[PDB]
Design a protein around this motif. Structure first.
Motif, PDB file in Angstrom:
ATOM      1  N   UNK A  25       0.823  -1.198   0.000  1.00  0.00           N
ATOM      2  CA  UNK A  25       0.000   0.000   0.000  1.00  0.00           C
ATOM      3  C   UNK A  25       0.861   1.255   0.000  1.00  0.00           C
ATOM      4  N   UNK A  26       1.997   1.214   0.701  1.00  0.00           N
ATOM      5  CA  UNK A  26       2.930   2.336   0.672  1.00  0.00           C
ATOM      6  C   UNK A  26       3.373   2.616  -0.760  1.00  0.00           C
ATOM      7  N   UNK A  27       3.615   1.561  -1.544  1.00  0.00           N
ATOM      8  CA  UNK A  27       3.973   1.755  -2.949  1.00  0.00           C
ATOM      9  C   UNK A  27       2.831   2.400  -3.724  1.00  0.00           C
ATOM     10  N   UNK A  28       1.590   1.974  -3.453  1.00  0.00           N
ATOM     11  CA  UNK A  28       0.425   2.571  -4.107  1.00  0.00           C
ATOM     12  C   UNK A  28       0.389   4.072  -3.855  1.00  0.00           C
ATOM     13  N   UNK A  29       0.607   4.482  -2.607  1.00  0.00           N
ATOM     14  CA  UNK A  29       0.514   5.907  -2.313  1.00  0.00           C
ATOM     15  C   UNK A  29       1.705   6.670  -2.892  1.00  0.00           C
ATOM     16  N   UNK A  30       2.902   6.078  -2.862  1.00  0.00           N
ATOM     17  CA  UNK A  30       4.030   6.692  -3.557  1.00  0.00           C
ATOM     18  C   UNK A  30       3.768   6.804  -5.052  1.00  0.00           C
ATOM     19  N   UNK A  31       3.079   5.820  -5.629  1.00  0.00           N
ATOM     20  CA  UNK A  31       2.771   5.878  -7.051  1.00  0.00           C
ATOM     21  C   UNK A  31       1.705   6.928  -7.336  1.00  0.00           C
ATOM     22  N   UNK A  32       0.710   7.046  -6.460  1.00  0.00           N
ATOM     23  CA  UNK A  32      -0.257   8.133  -6.588  1.00  0.00           C
ATOM     24  C   UNK A  32       0.437   9.491  -6.551  1.00  0.00           C
ATOM     25  N   UNK A  33       1.431   9.642  -5.675  1.00  0.00           N
ATOM     26  CA  UNK A  33       2.163  10.901  -5.571  1.00  0.00           C
ATOM     27  C   UNK A  33       2.833  11.265  -6.893  1.00  0.00           C
ATOM     28  N   UNK A  34       3.617  10.346  -7.461  1.00  0.00           N
ATOM     29  CA  UNK A  34       4.292  10.692  -8.709  1.00  0.00           C
ATOM     30  C   UNK A  34       3.280  10.858  -9.846  1.00  0.00           C
ATOM     31  N   UNK A  35       2.121  10.194  -9.761  1.00  0.00           N
ATOM     32  CA  UNK A  35       1.082  10.397 -10.770  1.00  0.00           C
ATOM     33  C   UNK A  35       0.509  11.811 -10.699  1.00  0.00           C
TER      34      UNK A  35
END
Lengths: 177, 177, 177, 177
Positions: A25-35
């Motif tokens: 989930x941490x990766x999901x939120x980091x990916x949302x950030x760069x998106x």
């Protein structure tokens, strides 16, 4: 006193699949950030300064959310595992299409939290369900917010004048109902 | 000293049909309140946040008006009779059509007060005509206000850009001429 | 992106029986509001001004609670359905009997929320359980509050002097332990 | 320019029976004033200091109301005619009985204004009906107020403890719902 996998004193062991789900989930939120960063850039390229400012702030917020999860793993004496981050989407044909990806990204972030929540419930990890509760509450507000912005942009129906008006609303901080 | 129908000391008896007319008018204003609530919801569903905020405030105001009438009945030592409240209208095809219902609802509220006024005059109830006077004055301002908002929305002629501009006016509190 | 039943972008579909349960709960809270209004009037008719002021405030608060639920349905992209509102009870033989109805109304409001909560849990709707959590917390405080006021009025044992003292407490805002 | 009966320039002649009715009403309000003075004295004789203070203020207010009417006659270029003032009632068997006379005196004052109002309407004297309107509005508030105080004193049911509590309310200025 037992020692947790990250070396700190361990209040209660965490099930390995739940640990894995939180790390993902941490990766999901980091990916949302760069998106949101990529969306910020797309808007700046088209002189939509209000949208650029809005998404620049969202990228920083999503990263803060990710870090908040890493702090929880520290608090539970669990190891973090920061993962490879995919490249974000960077091309859209219209602001309406970008806002659709933005709304779906927020909904997908909530789905990820819900998945962690269900796993915690199955493992009777009340610390994790309590930790997630205010985060789900914030996701409800974010979904409401992105539905508002998406619907406002769709209402504009591609008219530049209407999109400039909305852009100026966002620059002023008028981002919710 | 005589006792009124609600048990308080009675300054002057009220004619039963006038009492009935005031009780019905309270229902009219309670119904106007829930109607503005429904209109608030309709606007929020379409991301018209300024209209949503305006009608949310109007619902609370109309309820205050209704309560003001219940206080008058107490002051006259008369019984209140809070009635069943019908469900409001909840569907409109456009903001112009919603604003038309809103204006007609205000005009119908004034017609109801006028009906109570005429009954009080026939019964020579000067307390009631004096009580209603400032309420009629407020209805004149409300009719002027809703005619302004309706006419502004009609002038927009269904253009989303114009409706967004008006929506932002209402969010800022610019609701009258 | 999918569209919800109220037309907004849909983050996650809601089970129809859960939607129906939330809409019914909104009616419960609207009915509690008009019931506190009727209780306010009953107290004003007997010159219990502190109780009148207390219940007048409670009616406005319960209506705010109802509106808060309509906002959640908007946030979930679900349709609201504002229903016919029954007439409230309006006659009591004593303040002790009125306060008993008031306490039971608060307890019944909590039971309604609990029913929605259980349905959300069965459908794994974590958004709804998280949304309801602070509302249940407020109901605990309200139940504690109405138990305090009911017990204080019962302690008075119908003595007018004691009821005047309690009435003055409420007028001053002394409504809890 | 014509000269009125008091010698000032005359904007519009007043019907002699309406003039007579206004002059009589001034006597009614002067009589109400000395009656509240007598009630003030009765309360002070029984150490009901809050009631004494309340009625002392009411006597001064009623005299102000009387003077306000004399100013209207001056404004209409009509003669005043200050009349013999009867002695007030001065003996009561209880505070409940005194408060009953006080409420009836306020209701009788309103009846007097209503009588002047009807005469003005028959003579189409719109200046006088407009002048009386806010005075009727104040009488509604005064009737509500005296019904509150009378009902509170009756609720006490002659218990000294309850009457001391009410007396202290009045001393603090708590004289209305």
């Amino acid at each position: 006193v037992a020692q947790g996998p990250n070396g700190r004193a361990l209040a209660e062991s965490m099930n390995p699949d739940l640990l894995s789900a939180i790390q993902q989930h941490i990766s999901i939120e980091r990916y949302a950030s760069v998106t949101y960063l990529a969306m910020s850039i797309w808007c700046a390229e088209r002189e939509l300064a209000g949208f650029y400012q809005f998404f620049d702030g969202e990228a920083k917020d999503e990263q803060s959310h990710a870090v908040h999860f890493t702090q929880y793993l520290i608090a539970r004496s669990q190891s973090n595992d920061l993962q490879t981050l995919d490249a974000p989407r960077q091309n859209w044909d219209s602001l309406a299409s970008l806002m659709a990806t933005a709304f779906q990204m927020e909904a997908d972030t909530t789905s990820s939290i819900q998945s962690v929540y269900a796993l915690a419930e199955r493992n009777s990890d009340t610390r994790t369900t309590v930790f997630l509760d205010p985060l789900i509450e914030a996701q409800i507000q974010s979904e409401d917010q992105f539905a508002y912005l998406l619907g406002r942009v769709k209402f504009a129906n591609g008219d530049p004048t209407a999109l400039l008006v909305i852009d100026n609303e966002l620059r002023a901080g008028q981002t919710q109902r």
